[PDB]
Design an enzyme around this catalytic site. Structure first.
Site, PDB file in Angstrom:
ATOM      1  N   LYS A   1       0.867  14.483   1.591  1.00 55.98           N
ATOM      2  CA  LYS A   1      -0.418  14.844   0.981  1.00 55.98           C
ATOM      3  C   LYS A   1      -0.427  16.339   0.664  1.00 55.98           C
ATOM      4  CE  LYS A   1      -2.924  11.147   3.047  1.00 55.98           C
ATOM      5  NZ  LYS A   1      -3.745  10.115   2.354  1.00 55.98           N
TER       6      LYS A   1
ATOM      7  N   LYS B   1      -8.598  14.188   3.903  1.00 54.06           N
ATOM      8  CA  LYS B   1      -7.832  12.941   4.009  1.00 54.06           C
ATOM      9  C   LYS B   1      -6.968  13.076   5.268  1.00 54.06           C
ATOM     10  CE  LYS B   1      -5.368  14.002   0.164  1.00 54.06           C
ATOM     11  NZ  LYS B   1      -6.300  13.265  -0.739  1.00 54.06           N
ATOM     12  N   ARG B   2      -6.279  12.019   5.673  1.00 51.88           N
ATOM     13  CA  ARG B   2      -5.448  12.139   6.869  1.00 51.88           C
ATOM     14  C   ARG B   2      -4.414  13.240   6.638  1.00 51.88           C
ATOM     15  NH1 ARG B   2      -5.573   8.067  10.901  1.00 51.88           N
ATOM     16  NH2 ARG B   2      -3.902   9.342  11.835  1.00 51.88           N
TER      17      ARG B   2
ATOM     18  N   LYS C   1     -13.880   8.863  -5.075  1.00 53.76           N
ATOM     19  CA  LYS C   1     -15.165   9.195  -4.480  1.00 53.76           C
ATOM     20  C   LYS C   1     -15.696  10.510  -5.045  1.00 53.76           C
ATOM     21  CE  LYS C   1     -13.511   6.969  -0.390  1.00 53.76           C
ATOM     22  NZ  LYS C   1     -13.238   7.308   0.975  1.00 53.76           N
TER      23      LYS C   1
ATOM     24  N   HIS D   1       0.773  -1.248   0.000  1.00 51.46           N
ATOM     25  CA  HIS D   1       0.000   0.000   0.000  1.00 51.46           C
ATOM     26  C   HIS D   1       0.803   1.297   0.000  1.00 51.46           C
ATOM     27  CE1 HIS D   1      -4.104  -1.633   0.580  1.00 51.46           C
ATOM     28  NE2 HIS D   1      -3.470  -2.628   1.176  1.00 51.46           N
TER      29      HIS D   1
ATOM     30  N   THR E   1      -8.128   6.854  -2.734  1.00 41.89           N
ATOM     31  CA  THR E   1      -9.478   6.380  -3.054  1.00 41.89           C
ATOM     32  C   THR E   1     -10.476   7.518  -2.911  1.00 41.89           C
ATOM     33  OG1 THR E   1      -9.445   5.389  -0.825  1.00 41.89           O
ATOM     34  CG2 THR E   1      -9.411   3.883  -2.715  1.00 41.89           C
TER      35      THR E   1
HETATM   36  C1  LIG Z   1     -11.954   7.388   1.335  1.00 42.38           C
HETATM   37  C2  LIG Z   1     -11.462   7.807   2.776  1.00 42.38           C
HETATM   38  C3  LIG Z   1     -10.099   7.990   3.064  1.00 42.38           C
HETATM   39  C4  LIG Z   1      -8.989   7.846   1.999  1.00 42.38           C
HETATM   40  O1  LIG Z   1      -8.810   9.114   1.358  1.00 42.38           O
HETATM   41  P1  LIG Z   1      -7.500   9.446   0.473  1.00 42.38           P
HETATM   42  O2  LIG Z   1      -7.752  10.815   0.000  1.00 42.38           O
HETATM   43  O3  LIG Z   1      -7.261   8.336  -0.499  1.00 42.38           O
HETATM   44  O4  LIG Z   1      -6.305   9.471   1.527  1.00 42.38           O
HETATM   45  C5  LIG Z   1      -9.714   8.337   4.319  1.00 42.38           C
HETATM   46  N1  LIG Z   1     -10.628   8.502   5.303  1.00 42.38           N
HETATM   47  C6  LIG Z   1     -11.944   8.344   5.054  1.00 42.38           C
HETATM   48  C7  LIG Z   1     -12.898   8.819   6.124  1.00 42.38           C
HETATM   49  C8  LIG Z   1     -12.383   7.987   3.785  1.00 42.38           C
HETATM   50  O5  LIG Z   1     -13.745   7.908   3.508  1.00 42.38           O
END
Ligand SMILES: *Cc1c(COP(=O)(O)O)cnc(C)c1O
Ligand SMILES: O=C(O)CCCOc1ccc(NC(=O)NC(=O)c2ccc(Cl)cc2Cl)c(Cl)c1
Ligand SMILES: O=C(O)CCCOc1ccc(NC(=O)NC(=O)c2ccc(Cl)cc2Cl)c(Cl)c1
Ligand SMILES: *Cc1c(COP(=O)(O)O)cnc(C)c1O
EC number: 2.4.1.1
Lengths: 816, 816
Positions: free
Chosen positions: A553, A547-548, A659, A356, A655
């Site tokens: 990032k 995101k985190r 979305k 990952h 991911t």
């Molecule tokens: C989809 C999702 C992530 C992953 O987001 P990235 O932008 O790929 O880091 C992290 N936290 C939650 C709450 C998510 O729904």
């Protein structure tokens, strides 16, 4: 109402009496003292009742037919709420909506009472949750195996602009979805020593901890399939954890049981970062040891283990469950008495590993002294695996002594360590990346030597998300207008979204797509004042990055742009600029100082920007508190611009990006992770790409990255850095951000300055397009209509065919 | 079948489908994989369903009518299993028996799967459980309040003759009877300090622990009344137990939550013994603080607290909940701002205290430094109470300076302590003993000074037991033959048992009474081989002594008799002696060395006696492992001789004695506790009384107890002591019992030797009577027919009328 199913006369009546049955018998309440929380439970129990019938036949079905079983081992399962998702997959949403309406209640209000099952940190854990949904929808005999933490990811609170962590007691009021199965309780061993006898080694004098399973149903989308997610809970035995006599105290012995039970107490809040703590290693062996015993017990029913790989497939979600390899060997060799070679053959053929990330600090390297003390036998097996593996290498590359040490599972140095990633490649018949670019990087860089030894093992399986929770559930309005034109089949066949391409010039559709996005933004803007209070303008562009919090990032790169916008407005106040509401959200790991500093910077910028009268409503900087799955379901359908700006080469896939694309947001990002395949699917003209490509980053590293150069040649950038340094954003504490500035200027591993210029230039172009509603919406249609590839149904179908050896099936199971 | 109710056609059908509903929907199982444990749960859920309707109306009833409420505060509630007891009180036993029969299951087999709710140590905790049953049956608005320990009294195991303790994880598989009520969760404070401001004192900087309530239904006997037992669980707040920032570790902060939650983790296994540990004090304040807040919140609904005592009665079961007095004051004065005097008046009028023992080592004397650190404000209030109380004494007895220090709630010495018993007498409007003799001893000895100050406070309320669980439930066969002659009304009106006196010469009855006792002994003898394995003779006299192991209970005196019997047989082998199976059972507190030594002696005697071929089947010595409520329900109905041989003056009352009398056992005991009132009720001719009376014990103490004298004048006694000393009973470890012998000879606080001669002489007389079946049975009838006074319905009716000020009522609540 929409296509959330039929509100049958008989079923709405049946639902109501069952709701009342539970309110009375289960909640022992009466309408006069029932709290909204009671109402939420009566409904949950009523909805859960509808799938038990299917749950039982599904499991009984797998027992009768006996297909190959897929075991998904992950230390994380970021599930979120489950009431609505179950209604959706069962086509009960409208019936339930109607029924509760007649009972005088607001279903949506009740839904908000459910606690998120936050048993994950971010991408990795949410992937496992989307996969489970897809494996059920594709009718695979799959089981999700993990740990049932009583405390998931901490709840984020912002105090004086700082993040405050607080225990996530999600089980406080109970979990109506799970069911304890105290019949399949298993013992797990720790410590002890190894005795080498006449006919084999023996793991002896171990401390025993019991593993109690809890099953949660995973319903497939409208196909009457309900798979199982089994989560293990640590329990102390009542004997030795009291019976090891000779003084100490009886009370103390009992209170000390919360020592063996601490193994499943809390999730480690680290996203893409490795912490070599013993409690973490224990959780990893605990879930592996219990799961394998359960797997073999099932197989023994279905002793030639030659057929084991034909009936069992265990997928490793990262290196966390990597001890499954040496543990499988231990059981086969030590307990079942299979010869090494036959055991290894079986192990390699049933195990498959998923990588990952490529950042070094995320790599699991466990100190040998730790494995030596806690799992003595496993360490012996790992040395033996390493020994035979390196012999294979030496035979393939005679005299390449450096390659030997590079490939060893054992790393020499300060303290010896075990490279868990090397262990996984060696004992798995397949190793995959999560996006085409990440998968290529694995072969060209990180695992180059392994790729040269066994090229056949390496594959790619681009991530995906579930269209059920990530479209139908969070964006029914969009799902409806799409269905009005092309039907409902796309929900389990996302590729059909392409058909929407032929409505790109449709005047009615353009107007509709734009209307649902506007309704979504108004609802979110309302939710914002409702639960968090402090207004925003729904007519502005919703610029969100959720995101985190991580340096890679680059939430920091986003910050520089926000400050730039602010400075330009102050320079020419009466010049027109497209209004924007930029929203940044995410949690920082508690020990991640830099990440916590960035959250303070964001809130600090907002303090200045949100209260400057000259700015007006043209720019608002908002920090989205406690970002989690349930919050993501609210912001994403309301976003206009999705920020995916990590430094090229660092985000394996991502991911959240997918979305946003599915929900009508345009994407501004770098050629990183899955971004590449998304732009490739939608056409680069329909994407806002900028910055360095992987190659450019490398070129820069060869010559050497010097942030001073950029600071010197860009006046706007220099102005920003001098604002931070002088305390423009932290008046009372002028040097508050010295660590950020220092880092940016002297140790920026992610070259934030290098992408600054191209980033604000590209941001200008999205503002230009937003000024043209019609064209913006038409580009949005091009993205949505071309997002089908990113469904986890596609990802799972590929894992199934190219790794597990099973054939997906969209066949409805014989009714409930 | 018996009078376990009617097996209606409609109700047996209804029961079956509901059993299947739960097996399917609740247990998610199918007949092919259902385990007996699943069957037990389907039934429990089905039976529980029948009282929720009544539970709700009962509680709603009390809200509408608003009667005076009775709050029974106890740190112990020895409940046992609850499935059968609920069936009995609901008249469902036969219907359920039939229904499960048709479903092809054995109800009795399923009943054995239920775990005992062992939240008590012995007499004190079982009393509270019997009381709850009686208060429900007498239609009183009563609530049992306590602590929900996740670990009750430890499970006893005998290893090599020694007792082994092991955690009682009774909640392991879940508790179908309780229901969490997370809406009435309350905060409890600890530590902190006191700030004295302008308008009152303030308890500040405290550590907060939350108290979560769990309600369990307490159904009355066939009157449609279902009261509630509320048990508190300790929960850590998610904030401060994480929010008190500035380094330490996030993981550690979460794991450290099991520190505040340790308060309700385990029951202290001390029976009639005081251990001044901080964890114990915390449990005591915890249950008191949460209960009072709940009590006042209820009252505030129903602010002149003048009417408080008119609507609230709180009974203190011993001194354990004694902090309720200073806590009530704290709330009234500190929070409600009532003047001291008005607050004290209210407190004294609502509180009543029950004393359970006179032994000094059982007395609660808490070190001041402990109260000072944990509950600073309470200590201040206790000093103020003490101050005003002693002023009352000085005014009543001018110049009696010694009386002043004798009566103080504060004890001077090594370390200052607070005498909790003195606190309870001072702040209660009633103080009662548990048996006439114990109540007189309180006035003449222990609390003489208090009695002289306020004679009106002291009362007596002889203990009792519930005829439902202790007759109908454990001995249906006896309950049936009794009902055949005098009806069923006696179950809730035990006095009617007197009517049985007129069948004392009835040839059929004599034969029946003797037949059920024989069937009970055969069933127990079978159970013995079934679960414990090693045969016994059902034709012998069943001599049983079952209660906690204590020096004052003199299990040791019983042992001397057993050895005497053995020695006489060895002397004259071919002489006829009435065969006996003497059974001794009970748990010893883990830290009670002497008590644990006695268990080893018992098993050691059995080792010798049970394997001597000359003895044959004339004498067996058996140790009853893990004696608990569910085991008591098995032995008692099967016993012939009940041993109640404590030293006169030490057993406050006892309740096991009453259990035996109701079930057809004859009693051999001393004039102690309730034994006196039992012999007084049955006639001394129908009782086997022996030994010293209280007076004789005192006379002996005046002159001085010298065990050597008895050893010198009784050859049989001397022979026994020399057998123990020489290792006759411990060959491999000849000096194993030196501590027992040493104690018996030099520090016997309970003069075991003093009652030896009269004890074996009296034992000869019971053997003589047993040789005459007809006469033995006729004496048994005289006991049973005269046991009615010992029902807890009588005890509760007296507490209600003479202490609480409420009128009992046998009125059926308006159906379910
Ligand atoms: C989809 C999702 C992530 C992953 O987001 P990235 O932008 O790929 O880091 C992290 N936290 C939650 C709450 C998510 O729904
Ligand atoms: O104003 C009005 O509505 C008119 C007056 C209505 O007053 C009422 C109505 C309903 C109730 N009570 C329950 O339903 N239920 C419970 O009390 C209850 C709740 C949980 C559990 Cl585990 C056990 C019980 Cl017994 C009570 Cl206590 C009072
Ligand atoms: O030999 C025979 O009887 C003929 C073959 C019968 O084979 C069967 C029959 C029944 C079952 N299974 C359940 O009822 N129930 C469950 O598996 C089950 C149990 C608990 C929970 Cl939380 C969830 C589920 Cl889905 C299964 Cl797996 C196989
Ligand atoms: C009734 C009972 C007791 C009390 O017995 P005594 O002989 O009064 O000490 C103790 N334990 C249990 C299991 C009981 O049923």
């Amino acid at each position: 109402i929409s296509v959330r199913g039929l509100a049958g006369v008989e079923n709405v009546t049946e639902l109501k009496k069952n709701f009342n049955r539970h309110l009375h018998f289960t909640l022992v309440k009466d309408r006069n003292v029932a709290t909204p929380r009671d109402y939420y439970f009566a409904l949950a129990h009523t909805v859960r009742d509808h799938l038990v019938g299917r749950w039982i036949r599904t499991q009984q079905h797998y027992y009768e037919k006996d297909p190959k079983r897929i075991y998904y081992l992950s230390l994380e399962f970021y599930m979120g709420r489950t009431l609505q998702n179950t209604m959706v997959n069962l086509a009960l949403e409208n019936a339930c909506d109607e029924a509760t309406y007649q009972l005088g209640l607001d279903m949506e209000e009740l839904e908000e009472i459910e606690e998120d099952a936050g048993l994950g940190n971010g991408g990795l854990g949410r992937l496992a949750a989307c996969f489970l949904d897809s494996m059920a929808t594709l009718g695979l005999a799959a089981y999700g195996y993990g740990i049932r933490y009583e405390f998931g990811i901490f709840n984020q609170k912002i105090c004086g602009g700082w993040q405050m962590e607080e225990a996530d007691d999600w089980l406080r009021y109970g979990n109506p979805w799970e069911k304890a199965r105290p019949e399949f309780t298993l013992p797990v061993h720790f410590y002890g020593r190894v005795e080498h006898t006449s006919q084999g080694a023996k793991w002896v004098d171990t401390q025993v901890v019991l593993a109690m399973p809890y099953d949660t149903p995973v319903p497939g989308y409208r196909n009457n399939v309900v798979n199982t997610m089994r989560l293990w809970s640590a329990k102390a035995p009542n004997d030795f954890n009291l019976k090891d006599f000779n003084v100490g105290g009886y009370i103390q012995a009992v209170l000390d049981r919360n020592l063996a039970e601490n193994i499943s107490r809390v999730l480690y809040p680290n996203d893409n970062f490795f912490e070599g703590k013993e409690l973490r290693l224990k959780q990893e062996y605990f879930v592996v040891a219990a799961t394998l015993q359960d797997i073999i017990r099932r197989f023994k029913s279905s002793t030639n283990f030659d057929a084991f790989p034909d009936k069992v497939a265990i997928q490793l979600n990262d290196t966390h469950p990597s001890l499954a390899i040496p543990e499988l060997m231990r059981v086969l060799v030590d307990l079942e008495r299979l010869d090494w070679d036959k055991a290894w053959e079986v192990t390699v053929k049933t195990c498959a590993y998923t990588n990952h990330t490529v950042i070094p600090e995320a790599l699991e390297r466990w100190p040998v002294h730790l494995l030596e003390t806690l799992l003595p036998r496993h360490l012996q097996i790992i040395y033996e695996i390493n020994q035979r593996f390196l012999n294979r290498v030496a035979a393939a590359f005679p005299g390449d002594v450096d390659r030997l040490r590079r490939m060893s599972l054992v790393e020499e140095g300060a303290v010896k360590r075990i490279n868990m990633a090397h262990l996984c490649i060696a004992g798995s018949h397949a190793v995959n990346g999560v996006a085409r670019i990440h998968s290529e990087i694995l072969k060209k860089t990180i695992f180059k030597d392994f790729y040269e030894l066994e090229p056949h093992k390496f594959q790619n399986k681009t991530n995906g998300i579930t269209p059920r929770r990530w479209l139908v559930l969070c964006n029914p309005g969009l799902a409806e207008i799409i269905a009005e034109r092309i039907g409902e089949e796309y929900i389990s066949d996302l590729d059909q979204l392409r058909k929407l391409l032929s409505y790109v010039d449709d005047e009615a559709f353009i107007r509709d797509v734009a209307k649902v996005k506007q309704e979504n933004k108004l609802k979110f803007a309302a939710y914002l004042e409702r639960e968090y209070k402090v207004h925003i303008n729904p007519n502005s562009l919703f610029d969100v990055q959720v995101k985190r919090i991580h340096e890679y990032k680059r939430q920091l790169l986003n910050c520089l742009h926000v400050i730039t916008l602010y400075n330009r407005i102050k320079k020419e106040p009466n010049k027109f600029v497209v209004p924007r509401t930029v929203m940044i959200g995410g949690k920082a790991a508690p020990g991640y100082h830099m990440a916590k500093m960035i959250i303070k910077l964001i809130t600090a910028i907002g303090d200045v920007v949100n209260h400057d009268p000259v700015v007006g409503d043209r720019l608002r900087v908002i920090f989205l508190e406690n970002y989690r799955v349930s919050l993501a379901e609210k912001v994403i359908p309301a976003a206009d611009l999705s920020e995916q700006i990590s430094t090229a080469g660092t985000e394996a896939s991502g991911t959240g990006n997918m979305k946003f694309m599915l929900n009508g947001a345009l994407t501004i990002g770098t050629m990183d992770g899955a971004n590449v395949e998304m732009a490739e699917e939608a056409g680069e003209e329909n994407f806002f790409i900028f910055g360095m490509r992987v190659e450019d980053v490398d070129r820069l590293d060869q010559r050497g990255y010097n942030a001073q150069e950029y600071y010197d040649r860009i006046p706007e950038l220099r102005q920003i850095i001098e604002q931070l340094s002088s305390g423009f954003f932290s008046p009372k504490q002028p040097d508050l951000f010295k660590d950020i500035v220092n880092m940016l200027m002297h140790h920026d591993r992610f070259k934030v300055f290098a992408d600054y210029e191209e980033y604000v230039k590209c941001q200008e172009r999205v503002s230009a397009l937003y000024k043209n509603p019609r064209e913006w919406t038409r580009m949005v249609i091009r993205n949505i209509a071309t997002s089908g590839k990113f469904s986890s149904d596609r990802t799972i179908a590929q894992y199934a065919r190219e790794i597990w050896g099973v054939e997906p099936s969209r066949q409805r199971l014989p009714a409930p």
